[PDB]
Amino acid sequence: SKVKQDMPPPGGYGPIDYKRNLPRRGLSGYSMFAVGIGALIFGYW
Amino acid sequence: TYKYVNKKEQESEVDMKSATDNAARILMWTELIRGLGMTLSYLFREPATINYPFEKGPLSPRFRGEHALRRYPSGEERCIACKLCEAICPAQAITIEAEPRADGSRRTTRYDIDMTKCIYCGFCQEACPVDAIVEGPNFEFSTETHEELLYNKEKLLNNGDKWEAEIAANIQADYLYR
Amino acid sequence: EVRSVFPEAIIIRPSDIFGREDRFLNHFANYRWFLAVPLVSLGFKTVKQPVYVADVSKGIVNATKDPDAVGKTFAFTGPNRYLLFHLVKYIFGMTHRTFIPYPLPLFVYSWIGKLFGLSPFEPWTTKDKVERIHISDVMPTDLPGLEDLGVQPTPLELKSIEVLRRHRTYRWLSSEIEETKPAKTVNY
Amino acid sequence: MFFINILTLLVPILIAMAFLTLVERKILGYMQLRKGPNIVGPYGILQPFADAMKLFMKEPMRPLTTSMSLFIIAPTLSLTLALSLWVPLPMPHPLINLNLGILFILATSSLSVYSILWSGWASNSKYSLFGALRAVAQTISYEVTMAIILLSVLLMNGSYSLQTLITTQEHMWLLLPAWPMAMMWFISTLAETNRAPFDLTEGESELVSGFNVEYAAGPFALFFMAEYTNIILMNALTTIIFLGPLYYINLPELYSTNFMMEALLLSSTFLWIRASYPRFRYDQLMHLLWKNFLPLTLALCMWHISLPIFTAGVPPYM
Amino acid sequence: MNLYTVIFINILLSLTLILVAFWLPQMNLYSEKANPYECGFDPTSSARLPFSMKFFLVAITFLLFDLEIALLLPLPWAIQTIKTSTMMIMAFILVTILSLGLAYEWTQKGLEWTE
Amino acid sequence: MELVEVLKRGVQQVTGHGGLRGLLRVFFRANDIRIGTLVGEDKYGNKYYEDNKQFFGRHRWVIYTTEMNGKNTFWDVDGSMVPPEWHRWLHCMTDDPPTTNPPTARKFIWTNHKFNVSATPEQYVPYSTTRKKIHEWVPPSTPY
Amino acid sequence: SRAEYVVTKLDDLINWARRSSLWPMTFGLACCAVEMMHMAAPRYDMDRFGVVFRASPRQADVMIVAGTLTNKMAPALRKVYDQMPEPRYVVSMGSCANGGGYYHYSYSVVRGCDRIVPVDIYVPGCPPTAEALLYGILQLQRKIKREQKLKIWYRR
Numbered sequence A: 001s002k003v004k005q006d007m008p009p010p011g012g013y014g015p016i017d018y019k020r021n022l023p024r025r026g027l028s029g030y031s032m033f034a035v036g037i038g039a040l041i042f043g044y045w
Numbered sequence B: 001t002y003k004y005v006n007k008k009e010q011e012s013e014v015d016m017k018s019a020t021d022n023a024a025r026i027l028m029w030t031e032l033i034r035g036l037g038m039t040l041s042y043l044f045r046e047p048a049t050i051n052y053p054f055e056k057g058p059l060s061p062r063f064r065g066e067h068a069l070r071r072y073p074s075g076e077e078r079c080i081a082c083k084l085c086e087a088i089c090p091a092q093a094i095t096i097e098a099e100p101r102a103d104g105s106r107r108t109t110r111y112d113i114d115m116t117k118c119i120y121c122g123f124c125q126e127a128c129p130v131d132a133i134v135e136g137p138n139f140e141f142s143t144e145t146h147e148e149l150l151y152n153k154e155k156l157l158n159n160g161d162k163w164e165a166e167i168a169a170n171i172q173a174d175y176l177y178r
Numbered sequence C: 001e002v003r004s005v006f007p008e009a010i011i012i013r014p015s016d017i018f019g020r021e022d023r024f025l026n027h028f029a030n031y032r033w034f035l036a037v038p039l040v041s042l043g044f045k046t047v048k049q050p051v052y053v054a055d056v057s058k059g060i061v062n063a064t065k066d067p068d069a070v071g072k073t074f075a076f077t078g079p080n081r082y083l084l085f086h087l088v089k090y091i092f093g094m095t096h097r098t099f100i101p102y103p104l105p106l107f108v109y110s111w112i113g114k115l116f117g118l119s120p121f122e123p124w125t126t127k128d129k130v131e132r133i134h135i136s137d138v139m140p141t142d143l144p145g146l147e148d149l150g151v152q153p154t155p156l157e158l159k160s161i162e163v164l165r166r167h168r169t170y171r172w173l174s175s176e177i178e179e180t181k182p183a184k185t186v187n188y
Numbered sequence D: 001m002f003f004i005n006i007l008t009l010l011v012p013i014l015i016a017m018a019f020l021t022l023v024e025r026k027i028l029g030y031m032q033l034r035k036g037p038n039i040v041g042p043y044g045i046l047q048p049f050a051d052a053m054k055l056f057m058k059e060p061m062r063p064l065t066t067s068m069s070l071f072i073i074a075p076t077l078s079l080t081l082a083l084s085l086w087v088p089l090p091m092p093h094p095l096i097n098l099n100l101g102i103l104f105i106l107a108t109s110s111l112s113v114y115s116i117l118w119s120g121w122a123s124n125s126k127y128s129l130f131g132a133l134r135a136v137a138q139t140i141s142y143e144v145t146m147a148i149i150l151l152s153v154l155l156m157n158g159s160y161s162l163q164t165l166i167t168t169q170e171h172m173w174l175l176l177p178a179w180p181m182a183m184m185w186f187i188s189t190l191a192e193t194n195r196a197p198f199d200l201t202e203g204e205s206e207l208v209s210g211f212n213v214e215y216a217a218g219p220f221a222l223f224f225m226a227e228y229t230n231i232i233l234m235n236a237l238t239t240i241i242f243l244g245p246l247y248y249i250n251l252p253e254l255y256s257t258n259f260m261m262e263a264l265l266l267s268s269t270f271l272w273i274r275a276s277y278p279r280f281r282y283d284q285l286m287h288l289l290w291k292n293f294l295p296l297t298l299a300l301c302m303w304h305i306s307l308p309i310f311t312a313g314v315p316p317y318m
Numbered sequence E: 001m002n003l004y005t006v007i008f009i010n011i012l013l014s015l016t017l018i019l020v021a022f023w024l025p026q027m028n029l030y031s032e033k034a035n036p037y038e039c040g041f042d043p044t045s046s047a048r049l050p051f052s053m054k055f056f057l058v059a060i061t062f063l064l065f066d067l068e069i070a071l072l073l074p075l076p077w078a079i080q081t082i083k084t085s086t087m088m089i090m091a092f093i094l095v096t097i098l099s100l101g102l103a104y105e106w107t108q109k110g111l112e113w114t115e
Numbered sequence F: 001m002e003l004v005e006v007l008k009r010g011v012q013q014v015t016g017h018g019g020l021r022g023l024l025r026v027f028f029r030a031n032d033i034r035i036g037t038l039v040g041e042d043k044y045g046n047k048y049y050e051d052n053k054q055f056f057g058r059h060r061w062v063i064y065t066t067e068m069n070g071k072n073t074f075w076d077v078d079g080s081m082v083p084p085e086w087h088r089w090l091h092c093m094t095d096d097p098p099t100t101n102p103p104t105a106r107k108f109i110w111t112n113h114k115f116n117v118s119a120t121p122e123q124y125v126p127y128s129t130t131r132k133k134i135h136e137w138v139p140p141s142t143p144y
Numbered sequence G: 001s002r003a004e005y006v007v008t009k010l011d012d013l014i015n016w017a018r019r020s021s022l023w024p025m026t027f028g029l030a031c032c033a034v035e036m037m038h039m040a041a042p043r044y045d046m047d048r049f050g051v052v053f054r055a056s057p058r059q060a061d062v063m064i065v066a067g068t069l070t071n072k073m074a075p076a077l078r079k080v081y082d083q084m085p086e087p088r089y090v091v092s093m094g095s096c097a098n099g100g101g102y103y104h105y106s107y108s109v110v111r112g113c114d115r116i117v118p119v120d121i122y123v124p125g126c127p128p129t130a131e132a133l134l135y136g137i138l139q140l141q142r143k144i145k146r147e148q149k150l151k152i153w154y155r156r
């Protein structure tokens, strides 16, 4: 019978990811200072 | 080819928005809450640990552990004192001494392995032209003394008479690769 | 009784042995935890001829190969017979702590040893230990000893620091053997 | 009856330290994709007792190069102060009601430093001395900020007593007026207790068990439990001062339970912080806490001096 | 008597625990375990030698800042006075002067360590 | 909801080892309550459960015997007690257990496996399997 | 009930403590130390069994000789073993330390750590699988479980 050698499947393997993926998130900074200062002024009152 | 890892293109763009963003990176520990959330994410994952004596890590038929001397299905001793397993053993762990068995057969009167010299490399089992000595599956033969790890013909034949049900099957899997 | 049962035997009779984990020099050096050391008759009228462990060991290990020594007793004594007061003074000089000697009778020191031996653990002192400490060692020259067996005995002054540096403090641990004005020997 | 109250205040805190050990190990584990102790007990509830018994049965060490007096009296001081700090804690009704409670806290902690600092000297070793000097630098870093932060915080309370903050926080946490003060106090409590990222005294890969390398047995156990008691103490102080739970004069047990919840969260945050970040360098710590926290601390002290006045919000004396 | 009682009790707890730690176990004392650790090999020298520290100036100014803490700490009692302006101005002067001294030390590189 | 389903699964785990006696006998002896399909028992009494929805280190596990060859293994559990019929399956060398795919029987293979022996008697003491190489002269039993 | 029974039970308790809280030492010289790390890794977590590393020997109850022991490193190993406070145990890991291993016949190798320190258990391999070293650790636990120290104290 014919050979069997554990070759890769026909059509190649799928696309592997290797690049960096660190997704941006969070608020705009303006909003964070605003929330802090609002809580601060409310607590002062 | 190549590529830079810690090289910005260049500088000289700033606005109040970017300054506020960097100043809220500072003063709020923004890039540290990310690591905190990472470790929190790991808190809620199924851990990879296993109850060892009950559930055990996966091994292969090629796995080489304890040593054992095998027989034919007739119960005949399979080694023939050809003494190349000791010739190639790169730690000089194997001493062999032979005689005619009084049946006129080539057999060993001696087969020792200092298992504190064996590097568990498998050269002996891939050199034995009869598949007499193998390197069995076992990895749970820790002892309280050095003398127990100085084997002889009887201990190896006992390991063979013990693990043949596993050795024969793993060989059944692993030949056609060798 | 050992002769009566098994003749062709060897009976070694050492003096009070000293060594790294003995109960002779360490026993006299642990008298610092009490702020003064008692000695019957201030140590005088008592003589000690100690021996080192290596000497007794080499003696036994050669006697198990010597074709002689089949019906022979031995006196593993060692050299430099010592008087107890001067010996404890040397111990408390090599162990650089202090030295406050004072006399004590044998009956009260025996009662002390008794109530110390009231212990489920390893006692610090016993009546028989006091008695054995305060009787002198026989002049051993009626018997062969080590040099008839192949060991040259070791003086205390050369091996005592190995035993006694454990007991020193800082300010004295880095002190040598040649700064202790050695003990005064006797012959009697 | 005061002795029974001492029991109720002492033995559960020791149980809670001993189980903070287990909680630390298990949370670090599950943050490391592993399971902590689950063998000795049903879920590891006996591993602290195993650890303690093993330590108190190991032979101690009285080395030759050391000073035995400081060597033995320093762990005593450490546990004694760590366990005396818990005494005036209002939860809500304290055992010892002092009019200068936080001063007692500050003095007791600044004396708790001396346990480390005398143990490291008596242990005549290079690593112990490294650790003692590192502790000197650490205290020099954080004590100024601790005092001024607590001053500016209590400037809207009116007193150094801790029972008064339960009334100051009757309707609102002090976290909202002062979140920056709370931030820097949290990091100060972190540098205090010699906890991560500011370990810097038991710096395993820099100082191989600094101030403890010559300590083996129950002495080492004493240092360990003192650390793990001061941790819970500092979290309790954070949640008493800032995260004020609910008083409800009829029901003090509600205060006790909400205090429990908040201190548990803050201690778990300490462990989380340990698992996340690496160690500082002990000059980066001084530079940080003198060049980022102290100017801002002084400025917010100024602000909280002005703020009672231009708001007409001066607190009362009793 | 209550605080004295609590502190005596904690002292007794610690001393009893150390007695237990020292007189319960079994000992095998000898000089190779009672000599200092120093990572396998023996010390080349003593630990009781001069240790050149490099934040001595920061230590002195910590002492001065602790005195400034002492001066600032009576404010929770000062604020209940009737004036409220002399104390305002004096606290402002004190804090601004402390911060000016800190800025001078910073610029003249005292907070930095002697390399 | 979801919480309810996982709590139902927890109840199934709690009530699937006989009763409280067996539940504790398993929990304090293996530190896991996880239920699986009984693949096959041993001649000593081991159980060899299985559950394939778990990840690839917990989908097969043993629940050891309380007495193997007179050792009282209720607590002194060890991994050597798994005979070679199940070593291959437990260490995931196969997907074919000895209930369906048993091994070839031979007249020299041990019928009674042995746990690891290193401290007891019944252990291995080494020695030379060879014989006297040089033979010494046996003198006569007579004079002259 | 009886004094001997009480002593047996107290022995069981103290053995359980020393057996469940053993604190090995960060002493890894060669390749075998990587399998020691992997036994500290999540799959075979040692801390599950109450086994946590302490870098100091004086806070350590056991040493794992994981690597080759040279003539130059043997004094340090012995100093460290001495500095460990009793009760203390040793575990030789790999053919390099149990015996000489792949370097038995060389000039700068001690042909067994058992020439320098006493060994309770020998773990064989080159390297041993982390499961194998875990078997060795649990075998040391089984060994401590049968000390009978207070029993001999009672019977003296």
Ligand SMILES: CCCCCCCCCCCCCCCCCC(=O)OC[C@H](COP(=O)(O)OCCN)OC(=O)CCCCCCCCCCCCCCCCC
Binding pocket: A037, A040, A041, B026, B027, B028, B029, B032, D180, D182, D183, D186, D187, D197, D238, D242, D273, D288, D292, D293
């Ligand atoms: C109404 C008008 C008036 C209003 C007045 C108020 C104005 C707004 C005030 C905002 C000030 C907030 C205070 C923030 C303090 C932090 C200061 C800072 O800049 O960070 C310090 C440090 C800097 O690190 P670096 O990268 O080197 O930057 C320095 C560059 N020279 O970076 C660090 O701190 C990192 C070291 C700390 C890491 C510790 C880990 C902490 C993890 C987060 C814990 C969060 C939980 C807090 C819970 C506390 C609740 C009690």
Ligand code: SF4
Binding pocket: B085, B088, B089, B090, B091, B093, B094, B113, B117, B118, B119, B120, B121, B122, B123, B124, B125, B135
């Ligand atoms: S596996 Fe390698 S080292 Fe071991 S006995 Fe065989 S040939 Fe020798």
Ligand code: SF4
Binding pocket: B078, B079, B080, B081, B082, B083, B084, B085, B086, B096, B124, B127, B128, B129, B130, B131, B132, B133
């Ligand atoms: S075991 Fe194999 S290689 Fe070695 S002597 Fe026997 S037949 Fe030859």
Ligand code: SF4
Binding pocket: B119, G030, G031, G032, G066, G067, G068, G093, G094, G095, G096, G097, G101, G102, G125, G126, G127, G128
């Ligand atoms: S026995 Fe093998 S794996 Fe272990 S240290 Fe030696 S060469 Fe490396």
